[PDB]
Design a protein around this ligand. Sequence first.
Ligand SMILES: Nc1ncnc2c1ncn2[C@@H]1O[C@H](C[C@@H](N)CC[C@H](N)C(=O)O)[C@@H](O)[C@H]1O
Ligand SMILES: [Cl-]
Ligand SMILES: [Cl-]
Length: 271
Amino acid sequence: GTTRHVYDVCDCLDTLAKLPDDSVQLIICDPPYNIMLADWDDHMDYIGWAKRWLAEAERVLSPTGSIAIFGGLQYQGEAGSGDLISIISHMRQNSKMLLANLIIWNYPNGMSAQRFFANRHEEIAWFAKTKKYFFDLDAVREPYDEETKAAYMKDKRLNPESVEKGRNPTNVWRMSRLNGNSLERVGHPTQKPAAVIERLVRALSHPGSTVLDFFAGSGVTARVAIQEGRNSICTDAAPVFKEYYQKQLTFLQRSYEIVEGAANFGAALQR
Ligand SMILES: Nc1ncnc2c1ncn2[C@@H]1O[C@H](C[C@@H](N)CC[C@H](N)C(=O)O)[C@@H](O)[C@H]1O
Ligand SMILES: [Cl-]
Ligand SMILES: [Cl-]
């Protein structure tokens, strides 16, 4: 099964406007949480701008599709900025999508703090377009060691199948962020680790389906999509994105094709 991956440098709304209704299965969304100076010509707050791509994201998702939105809960009230709560509140008022889960990404290390509890978490809001969203839990279950699995297998009160399939990873993920000495590092300041994206891709999309990322950043989504047998469309407004994408590809070096240019999005939409 050969997959196709398209990438390009452009604004998220320009990408979305080029995608047809219900054509995407999963969207990875790790958006900037502040608007640009020029954005003050048409908006009075962050959501004023964000609601545009949020509405479009929903439009391009298929009936069984989902969108995972990364964000924090530390917004301080600055004009033009916001956080995951700004988005969730907007979604509750204006979207029919369902909040299937609020995932806590609990990372091991971080900065210290003397006047408050040191921050060790970031959130992921998983929104499903409808109640018929796709979910592959078995694909992300965590297996028990042979010792524990044996102990449970003897407990007649427990379902043997559930035991062998492994445990639900829960909505709290203890995963490390990338460090400056990380191998998959490409130079992007807010680069996300492949491990977190793999879990979302494996559980929220089916093989051969399209994964879209319009705030692609380091291009980690394409690398994960290729490795996992999915098709992908990754775009970012920064020209340096093309540099990161090509860097992600070297980490791979399986049948897949890479295509540059928004005019070629269709190559990755074909099922
Ligand atoms: N209008 C836009 N269209 C497409 N990409 C954008 C736009 N504005 C910003 N970006 C890109 O989106 C990414 C935002 C990330 N830094 C977001 C990480 C994280 N949510 C944070 O803000 O800390 C970057 O790679 C930006 O180049
Ligand atoms: Cl939840
Ligand atoms: Cl990234």
